[PDB]
Amino acid sequence: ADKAVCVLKGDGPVQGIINFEQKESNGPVKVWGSIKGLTEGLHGFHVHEFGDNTAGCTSAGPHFNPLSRKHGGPKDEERHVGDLGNVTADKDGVADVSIEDSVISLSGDHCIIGRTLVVHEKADDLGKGGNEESTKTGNAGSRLACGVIGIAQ
Amino acid sequence: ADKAVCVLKGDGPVQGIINFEQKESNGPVKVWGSIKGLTEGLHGFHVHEFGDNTAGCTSAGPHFNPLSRKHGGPKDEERHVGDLGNVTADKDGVADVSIEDSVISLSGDHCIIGRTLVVHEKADDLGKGGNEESTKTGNAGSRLACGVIGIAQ
Numbered sequence: 001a002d003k004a005v006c007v008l009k010g011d012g013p014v015q016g017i018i019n020f021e022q023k024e025s026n027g028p029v030k031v032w033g034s035i036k037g038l039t040e041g042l043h044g045f046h047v048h049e050f051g052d053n054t055a056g057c058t059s060a061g062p063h064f065n066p067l068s069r070k071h072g073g074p075k076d077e078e079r080h081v082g083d084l085g086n087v088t089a090d091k092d093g094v095a096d097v098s099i100e101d102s103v104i105s106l107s108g109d110h111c112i113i114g115r116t117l118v119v120h121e122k123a124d125d126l127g128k129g130g131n132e133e134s135t136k137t138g139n140a141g142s143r144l145a146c147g148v149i150g151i152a153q
Numbered sequence: 154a155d156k157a158v159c160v161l162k163g164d165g166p167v168q169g170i171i172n173f174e175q176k177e178s179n180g181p182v183k184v185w186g187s188i189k190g191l192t193e194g195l196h197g198f199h200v201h202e203f204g205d206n207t208a209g210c211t212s213a214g215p216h217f218n219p220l221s222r223k224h225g226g227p228k229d230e231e232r233h234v235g236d237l238g239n240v241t242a243d244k245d246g247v248a249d250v251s252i253e254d255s256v257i258s259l260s261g262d263h264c265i266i267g268r269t270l271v272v273h274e275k276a277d278d279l280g281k282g283g284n285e286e287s288t289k290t291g292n293a294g295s296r297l298a299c300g301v302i303g304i305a306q
């Protein structure tokens with residue numbers, strides 16, 4: 001029923017439009033659209049806490065985590081709300097994102113509007129890397145592109 | 154107590170950083186910041202409806218208008234929720250934006266989080282133009298710079 005869109009831009013080649021659609025308030029969010037300018041492989045894909053690019057993607061803060069828990073995969077019991085896992089770019093560096101998630105919302109307590117969508121340099125290890133960063137940001141590395149998540153028509 | 158921040162960019166020289174603050178949920182929103190690259194004089198300053206910059210500033214839509222009203226000034230009972238009036242750029246082309254509004258909100262139904270703030274090329278005539286375009290957008294003309302409104306720390 002209610003929708004969201006997001007333009008990922010950054011300092012290098014990474015760009016693409018990512019749409020959000022949530023049919024009812026408690027139901028799942030569909031997350032789709034394509035990202036280009038990526039290296040082939042897995043890339044971290046998160047909603048970050050703050051919708052702030054005063055200083056590019058770095059101002060977007062840590063992973064949105066209103067339930068104050070640890071980082072994991074999208075299917076893990078232990079996850080921040082923004083923990084949307086990996087996207088996969090192909091040989092041309094095109095990641096055709098098609099995602100369904102029941103933990104993010106476009107309304108209520110876990111609402112992602114006005115927060116930042118970030119696509120990372122490396123793979124999100126899902127908390128399995130065996131280091132301090134792994135259980136925090138998934139060791140996905142730097143923030144290649146972002147955008148504020150905004151209400152769509 | 155709760156906070157929002159917005160970064161305006163366009164296809165030209167106009168750029169700035171606009172903060173929103175609100176002490177209680179019923180209370181007024183302090184809107185402060187600075188816009189540069191502007192021509193000297195008055196400039197349209199509105200919260201548009203859609204936090205969508207896929208087509209640049211255009212995809213933002215018309216002025217945020219839940220109460221389905223006509224366009225006016227922030228003083229008028231006849232105002233869109235997102236009619237924040239004018240901003241005045243100086244001889245150096247810099248507007249030191251400081252505005253107080255009890256109508257806009259950072260939580261609730263008149264929520265401006267995830268919508269687009271726009272700075273316009275011309276003065277907003279505040280609905281006193283004597284034309285159709287006056288009572289819809291304010292004859293402010295083209296959209297110089299914009300950005301989504303995001304929750305800040």
Ligand SMILES: [Cu+2]
Pocket residue numbers: 044046048063118120137140
């Ligand atoms: Cu991240």
Ligand SMILES: [Cu+2]
Pocket residue numbers: 197198199201216271273290293
């Ligand atoms: Cu406008």
Ligand SMILES: [Zn+2]
Pocket residue numbers: 063070071072080082083136137138
């Ligand atoms: Zn996380």
Ligand SMILES: [Zn+2]
Pocket residue numbers: 199216223224225233235236289290291
């Ligand atoms: Zn208006």
